[PDB]
Symmetry: D2
Subunit: 132 residues, 4 copies
C-alpha cells in the first residue's frame, strides 16, 4: 500500500531513494504499533512502578514514529530541512526506546519485541537520512 | 480477542498513512481544485484512525463504552473517506488505493465492534 | 451561530488534551502508580480523541455533518469516561481533580455542539 | 522550569490547531493550486507540533536527548511553516494568523531547547 501510493504520486520526487523511503514508512508504522503494545503491556505488569521510564519512552517513540511516517508520506512542496530534522528526531527516539526496552528484554518478552522493532526503525531512518 | 484487536490496530495505522498519502497526491494534481473534499476527508480519516489505533492499543476490556464509541467514529469516517475517494478512483490510482485501505479499515473496525458488543 | 459553539468546543478540546496529558504524567510519577493505571490509560485516550476532534472541527471544506457528529459523540463518551475515572482519585490527587473538571467542561461543550447540529 | 514546559506545550497545541485551520482555509480558496506548498507545510507542522506537545508532557529530564531532538524538529518545521505562510500573509488573513502562531511556537521551542 505504501509502495502503491508512492508509485502513483503525480510528479518526480527528485532523486530520493524511493524503496528506502517506503521501507522507512513501513518500519515507522510497525514501530509505533510495537511501542504502543509494549507501553500497554508494561502498564499491566505488577512491577509497573519500575517500568515508568520504559512506558514514557514507548509513548514518545509511538508519537514521533507516527509523525515521521506522515511527514515522509508527503511529497508536495518537499523541504529537505523538515524531512531531515524529523528523521533525525525519529532515529534519536528509536535509539533511546531501543536502549530502555533492551534493559527489560531479559525479563519481559514485550520489551524484547519492542527493542527489535526500534533498532530496525532506527536503522531504516539512518539509512534514509544518509541517502538524501 | 487480542488477534482481532492487533489486526484492527494495524489496519488503522495503514489507513492513516494511505489517507495522508492520498491527500498529498491530490494536492499535487493539476486538478487539485476538484479534489478538495477528497483531501479534507482524507485528513479527517488520518486523524481519527491515528486516535483509534492509540485507544485500541490500551484497551483492557474495562470501559468497553470508550472503545466502542471510538470504533464507531472510525468506521463512520473510513466509510465517508472510502465513498469520496471512490468517486475519483477511475481517474486517479491513488484514490483507488486509498478507497481500498479505507474499506479494509472500516470492515476491521466493524468486525471488532461486533465482537465486543 | 454554529461557529461560536464550534470555536468553544475546539478551545475546550485543546485545554482538555493538555489537562489529560498532565494528569497522565503526574499519575505516572506517583508512588501509587500501580493503582492509577486505568486513570493513565483513560487520560491518554482522552488526549488522543480530543486532539483528533479539535482537528476535525477546525475543517470546513467539504463539511459532512455525519462525520462531525460521529467524532463529537466519540469525544463526549471519552471525556465522560475520563471525568469518571479521574473523579475517583480527585480526593487524593489534585491533578485528577483538575483533569476531571476539564473533562466535564469538554464533555458538555461536545454534547452542546452535538445537540445543535442534529 | 516546568511552567516554561507547560507554556511550550500549550503553544504547540495551539500552533497545531492554527496550522490545521490555515490548511483548511487554503484548501477552500479559489487559488488553492498556488497554495499547495502552504497546505503541505501546515499539515507537517500540525503533526510535528502534536507529537512535540505529547513528548514534552512526559519529559522527566532523563533522556534529554529525546526532548532536544524533538524540539529541534519542531523549531525547524515551525520556521518553515512560518516562512511559507508569511509569503501569503499580504493576501490571506488566515496565513497572517498562522505565520504569527508558527513564529511564536518556533521561538518558544528554541527558548526551551536552549534552557535544557
Ligand atoms: Cu515491554
Ligand atoms: Cu482516501
Ligand atoms: Cu475534549
Ligand atoms: Cu486524570
Ligand atoms: Cu476532554
Ligand atoms: Cu520508527
Ligand atoms: Cu517503536
Ligand atoms: Cu514496555
Ligand atoms: Cu519504542
Ligand atoms: Cu518510534
Ligand atoms: Cu523513530
Ligand atoms: Cu521506538
Ligand atoms: Cu520500546
Ligand atoms: Cu520495556
Ligand atoms: Cu519496551
Ligand atoms: Cu520499541
Ligand atoms: Cu521506533
Ligand atoms: Cu525509523
Ligand atoms: Cu481506520
Ligand atoms: Cu485511511
Ligand atoms: Cu487523494
Ligand atoms: Cu483525493
Ligand atoms: Cu481516507
Ligand atoms: Cu481513517
Ligand atoms: Cu478505525
Ligand atoms: Cu476508520
Ligand atoms: Cu480512511
Ligand atoms: Cu478517502
Ligand atoms: Cu479521497
Ligand atoms: Cu487520491
Ligand atoms: Cu481521492
Ligand atoms: Cu483518496
Ligand atoms: Cu482511504
Ligand atoms: Cu481508514
Ligand atoms: Cu479501522
Ligand atoms: Cu481531557
Ligand atoms: Cu484519570
Ligand atoms: Cu482525561
Ligand atoms: Cu479528551
Ligand atoms: Cu469533545
Ligand atoms: Cu472529549
Ligand atoms: Cu491525575
Ligand atoms: Cu487520575
Ligand atoms: Cu481526566
Ligand atoms: Cu477528557
Ligand atoms: Cu469536548
Ligand atoms: Cu509548535
Ligand atoms: Cu502551527
Ligand atoms: Cu492556509
Ligand atoms: Cu496556506
Ligand atoms: Cu503551520
Ligand atoms: Cu507546528
Ligand atoms: Cu514546537
Ligand atoms: Cu513547532
Ligand atoms: Cu507551524
Ligand atoms: Cu505555515
Ligand atoms: Cu502556510
Ligand atoms: Cu492561510
Ligand atoms: Cu498560508
Ligand atoms: Cu498558512
Ligand atoms: Cu501556517
Ligand atoms: Cu502557522
Ligand atoms: Cu507551530
Ligand atoms: Cu513551539
Amino acid at each position: 500500500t505504501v509502495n502503491d501510493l508512492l508509485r502513483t504520486y503525480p510528479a518526480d520526487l527528485g532523486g530520493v531513494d524511493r524503496e528506502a523511503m517506503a521501507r522507512c514508512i513501513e518500519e515507522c508504522l510497525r514501530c509505533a504499533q510495537a511501542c504502543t503494545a509494549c507501553a500497554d503491556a508494561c502498564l499491566s505488569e505488577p512491577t509497573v512502578a519500575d517500568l515508568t521510564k520504559c512506558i514514557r519512552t514507548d509513548m514518545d517513540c509511538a508519537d514521533v514514529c507516527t509523525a515521521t511516517a506522515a511527514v515522509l508520506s508527503r511529497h508536495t512542496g518537499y523541504d529537505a530541512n523538515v524531512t531531515r530534522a524529523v528523521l533525525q528526531a525519529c532515529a534519536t527516539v528509536c535509539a533511546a526506546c531501543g536502549d530502555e526496552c533492551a534493559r527489560h528484554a531479559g525479563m519481559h518478552e514485550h520489551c524484547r519485541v519492542c527493542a527489535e522493532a526500534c533498532r530496525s526503525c532506527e536503522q531504516a531512518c539512518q539509512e534514509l537520512l544518509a541517502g538524501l
